[model samples]
Target: DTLQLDNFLTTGFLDIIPLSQPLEFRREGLQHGVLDKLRSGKYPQQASLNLLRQPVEECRKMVFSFIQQALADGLRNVLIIHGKGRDDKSHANIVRSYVARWLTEFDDVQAYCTALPHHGGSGACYVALRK
Candidate 1:
């Protein structure tokens, strides 16, 4: 029996690592009215950004900016509500995934976990930023 090993390379094979389950981060949900308030003004302690209605790229930029501003303002905690897409028949939450991915890339983000059950649970996350 002859093995076709054209695509396999020894050096590349050695660098491959087994995939692991990603950290389960928690999130919360907030009403549109409340989120609007946070975005409209400056927050002394923290700020919450809502990404439900915005496009994925816009949400990403907005979220990145918000996090930076929050940290600069000396805020320690912030709430981000990415809707669960309950009503959308397609059920494709492009923004939510983008937000999650971007958050994981930031080194200053100490720990992020799902929001409390009452807050949003799986739909939102609380990001603990490091000073």
Candidate 2:
């Protein structure tokens, strides 16, 4: 709960990613090979968080703390299940969009991408955190 949510602005213009597309991001200077490994789910999963039923505000708070604490605990690979949306403006889709954007804000996050089908498909993502 100590993680501040001020940096995650809720009122500003959000560059929403389309619901049908898979989320993918790698920090500048991060190797594509690293992202590729994450996408392939090659790293052992060290942690996971589910935000499917939470409200957007709550989702933001939980995500902020989860990543921070997980990294602090030395977790490098993780999963986040945001659930696939029924439509572009649906609650799940909204959460998914924000989750995608939020992962980029964490400097420790090396890269992330949509998980493969067995891992939850577009409804979930795999995150690779820096050591």
Can you write out model 1's per-residue Cα lDDT over 8-40, one digit (the tens) per residue? 111211221112212244334433344333223
C-alpha lDDT of candidate 2 relative to the true structure: 0.80
What TM-score do all the candidates reach, one by one?
0.59, 0.84
Cα lDDT tens digits, model 2, 62-87, are: 88888878888887688999998888
Candidate 1 has its poorest 10 consecutive residues by lDDT at: 9-18
| Deviation from native of the Cα of residue 30 in model 2, angstroms | 2.3
